[PDB]
């Protein structure tokens, strides 16, 4: 069960990382949006 | 002990992720600060 517990923790951690990765893609679009507006 | 070693590693990894997550919150404030200044 201790092995299963670690596996469930690491699954959860990977989901957290994926949420940060998607936040990063939104921040690239935000910086792109600022750069677009000052170059309009 | 190998199970305990993995657990300590994953604890450490989670702390690293939390540092990146907080860096992300500071980058949102930075992009907000740029957007605020060009809209002043």
């Amino acid at each position: 069960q201790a092995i299963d517990n670690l596996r469930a923790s690491l699954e959860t951690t990977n989901q957290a990382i994926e949420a940060i990765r998607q936040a990063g893609q939104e921040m690239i679009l935000a910086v792109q949006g600022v750069q677009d507006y000052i170059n309009n | 002990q190998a199970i305990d070693n993995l657990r300590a590693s994953l604890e450490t990894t989670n702390q690293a992720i939390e540092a990146i997550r907080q860096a992300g919150q500071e980058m949102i404030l930075a992009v907000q600060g740029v957007q605020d200044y060009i809209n002043n």
């Binding site: 949420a19 936040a23 | 997550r21």
Partner: peptide, 28 residues
Amino acid sequence: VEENLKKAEEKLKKAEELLKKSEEILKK
């Protein structure tokens, strides 16, 4: 730009929730 930063903030909050869940599983 504000919509993109809102969506980013939402995803960072979901990441925090998931990290606390990971930590709680490890405690067990």
